Amino acid sequence: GMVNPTVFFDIAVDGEPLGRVSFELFADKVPKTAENFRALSTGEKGFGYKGSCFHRIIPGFMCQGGDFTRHNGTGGKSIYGEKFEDENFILKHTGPGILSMANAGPNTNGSQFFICTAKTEWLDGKHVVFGKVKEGMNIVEAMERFGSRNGKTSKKITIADCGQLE
Amino acid sequence: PECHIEAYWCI
Ligand SMILES: *CC(=O)Nc1ccc(NC(=O)C*)cc1
Ligand SMILES: [N]
């Protein structure tokens, strides 16, 4: 009876399997943003997250990824073009596991995203929350240990596989 | 700019 999609990332450390993280996507609250992430996880539009890396990881903050075009952390594109408007700001950054959109100002949402590892209320109203870690948060915690204070990672944290579970 | 990094930096 209408159920929020569930997608997974199989995380790899320099090609070594680390573990699976699954996300609920709040299609009920933000349909356009949830669908962007869902389809980039399946690649069903011809492009998506598979093979991309988490290029900025700041312990105590978040794990950022989603640039599958240039891979340097400046690229990425949505399924609607290269950017789409801020759908809404209903859902908040309530704690670890929150899935939020990175941007460069209002209405500049692309494909880059971050997984919060803490409460980040000072992001409310500027970045669109669209999902939340369902399971595998212990895997996200391990990814955090490869980060640094400026986000540089000490190994290649890549999305070795991704897709949809539900 | 990366607004969430700049927010983290200001905080
Ligand atoms: C893109 C954007 O919104 N950047 C930004 C700059 C400065 C601050 N300052 C504080 O939070 C105190 C927030 C966001
Ligand atoms: N800060």
Residue numbers in the entry:
A (entry chain A): 0 to 165
B (entry chain E): 1 to 11
Sentences from the paper on this structure:
To target disease-causing proteins that are inaccessible to small-molecule or antibody therapies, we are exploring the use of a nature-inspired drug modality that exploits the intrinsically favorable properties of synthetically constrained α-helical polypeptides (Helicons). Here, we report a rapid, high-throughput screening platform utilizing phage display that enables an unbiased mapping of the α-helical interactome of a given protein without any prior knowledge of its structure or known binding partners. Analysis of 14 high-resolution crystal structures of Helicon–protein complexes across six different protein domains reveals a range of binding modes, all of which are “side-on”, i.e., mediated exclusively by Helicon side-chains rather than involving main chain amide interactions. Biochemical and structural experiments demonstrate diverse functional impacts by the Helicons which bind these sites, including inhibition of protein–protein interactions, inhibition of enzymatic activity, induced conformational rearrangement, and induced dimerization.
To assess the ability of Helicons to bind and modulate the function of enzymes, we screened the cyclin-dependent kinase CDK2, involved in the regulation of the cell cycle, and also the peptidyl-prolyl cis-trans isomerase Cyclophilin A (PPIA), which binds non-α-helical peptide substrates and catalyzes the cis-trans isomerization of proline residues. Peptidyl-prolyl cis-trans isomerases (PPIases) are a family of enzymes that recognize a diverse range of proline-containing polypeptide substrates, and are targets of the “trimerizer” natural products CsA and Sanglifehrin A that bind PPIA to form ternary complexes with the proteins Calcineurin and IMPDH2, respectively. A Helicon screen for PPIA binders afforded a pair of shifted clusters that competed with CsA both in the phage screen and in in vitro biochemical assays. Cocrystal structures of Helicons from both Clusters C53 and C54 confirmed that they bound the site ordinarily occupied by peptide substrates or natural products, providing a second instance where the screening platform was able to identify an α-helical binding solution to a site ordinarily recognized by peptides in a non-α-helical conformation. A PPIase assay showed that these Helicons inhibit PPIA activity, as expected given their orthosteric binding mode, demonstrating the ability of Helicons to directly block enzymatic function.
